[PDB]
Amino acid sequence: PGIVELPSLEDLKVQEVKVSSSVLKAAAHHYGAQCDKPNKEFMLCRWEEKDPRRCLEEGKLVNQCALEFFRQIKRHCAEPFTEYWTCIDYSGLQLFRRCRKEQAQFDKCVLDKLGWVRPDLGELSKVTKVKTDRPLPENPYHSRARPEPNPEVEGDLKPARHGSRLFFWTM
Amino acid sequence: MLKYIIPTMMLMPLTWLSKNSMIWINTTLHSLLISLTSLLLLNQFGDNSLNFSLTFFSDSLSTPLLILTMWLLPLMLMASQHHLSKENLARKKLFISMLILLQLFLIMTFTATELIFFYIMFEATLVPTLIIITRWGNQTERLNAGLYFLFYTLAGSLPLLVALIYIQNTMGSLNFLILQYWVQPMPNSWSNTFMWLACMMAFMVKMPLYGLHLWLPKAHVEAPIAGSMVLAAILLKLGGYGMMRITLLLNPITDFMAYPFIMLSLWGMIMTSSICLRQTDLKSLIAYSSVSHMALVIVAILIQTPWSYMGATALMIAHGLTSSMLFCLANSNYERVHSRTMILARGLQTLLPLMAAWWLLASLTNLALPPSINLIGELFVVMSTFSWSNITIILMGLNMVITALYSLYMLITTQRGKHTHHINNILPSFTRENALMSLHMLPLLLLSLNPKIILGPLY
Ligand SMILES: CCCCCCCCCCCCCCCCCC(=O)OC[C@H](COP(=O)([O-])OC[C@H](O)COP(=O)([O-])OC[C@H](COC(=O)CCCCCCCCCCCCCCCCC)OC(=O)CCCCCCCCCCCCCCCCC)OC(=O)CCCCCCCCCCCCCCCCC
Ligand SMILES: CCCCCCCCCCCCCCCCCC(=O)OC[C@H](COP(=O)([O-])OC[C@H](O)COP(=O)([O-])OC[C@H](COC(=O)CCCCCCCCCCCCCCCCC)OC(=O)CCCCCCCCCCCCCCCCC)OC(=O)CCCCCCCCCCCCCCCCC
Ligand SMILES: CCCCCCCCCCCCCCCCCC(=O)OC[C@H](COP(=O)([O-])OCC[N+](C)(C)C)OC(=O)CCCCCCCCCCCCCCCCC
- State whether the Cα torsion B58-B248-B319-B160 is positive or negative: negative
CA gap A99, A90 in Å, rounded: 10
> B54–A167: do the CB atoms touch at under 8 Å?
no
CA gap B403, B294 in Å, rounded: 13
How would DSSP label each residue in B337-348?
HS--BTTTS--G
Nearest Cα to Cα of residue B375 among B272, B284, B383: B383
Which ligand is closest in space to the CA of residue B102?
A: 1
Which atom belonging to ligand 3 lies closest to the Cα atom of B200?
7
For chain B, how many residues are written?
A: 459
How many whole angstroms from B256 Cα to the centroid of ligand 3? 18
> A167–B55: do the CB atoms touch at under 8 Å?
no
Q: Which amino acid residue places its CA nearest to atom 62 of ligand 2?
A: B357
Cβ atoms B177, B143 nearer than 8 A: no
> In a 3-state reduction of DSSP, which class is residue B312?
helix
Cβ atoms B202, B157 nearer than 8 A: yes
**Resolution of the model in angstroms:** 2.7
Check pocket membership of B449 for ligand 2, CB cut-off 6 A: yes
Nearest Cα to Cα of residue B129 among B217, B241, B222, B231: B231
Check pocket membership of B13 for ligand 1, CB cut-off 6 A: yes
State the amino acid at position B137 in one-letter form.
G
CA gap B221, B144 in Å, rounded: 12
CA dihedral A171, B5, B8, B11 (to 10 degrees): 50
Residue environment code for B164-201, b if the CB has 16+ CB neighbours within 10 A, otherwise e = beebeeeeebbbbeebeeeeeebeeeeeeeebbbbbbb
CA distance A163 to chain B (A): 13
Check pocket membership of B166 for ligand 3, CB cut-off 6 A: yes
> A167–B117: do the CB atoms touch at under 8 Å?
yes
> In a 3-state reduction of DSSP, which class is residue B108?
coil
Give domain limits for chain B.
1-459
How many whole angstroms from B114 Cα to the centroid of ligand 3? 22
Cα A67 to chain centroid, rounded: 19
CA gap B325, B68 in Å, rounded: 13
How would DSSP label each residue in B181-237?
TSPPP--SSHHHHHHHHHHHHHHHHHTTPTTSGGGHHHHTTSS-HHHHHHIIIIITH
Check pocket membership of B118 for ligand 1, CB cut-off 6 A: no
CA dihedral A131, A133, A134, A136 (to 10 degrees): 60
Instruction: List strand residue ranges (DSSP E) for B331-427, in order.
Output: none
Residue environment code for B58-96, b if the CB has 16+ CB neighbours within 10 A, otherwise e = bbbbbbbbbbbbbbbbbbbbbbbbebbeeeeeeebbbbb
The maximal CA–CA distance of chain A, rounded, in angstroms, is 102
How many whole angstroms from B438 Cα to the centroid of ligand 2? 11
CA dihedral A116, A117, A118, A124 (to 10 degrees): -100
Cα B312 to chain centroid, rounded: 12
Identify the H or E element spanning B396. Answer: helix B393-415
The verdict on whether omega for the bond into residue B208 sits within 30 degrees of 0, i.e. cis, is: yes
State the amino acid at position A46 in one-letter form.
R
> A168–B168: do the CB atoms touch at under 8 Å?
no
The verdict on whether omega for the bond into residue A137 sits within 30 degrees of 0, i.e. cis, is: no
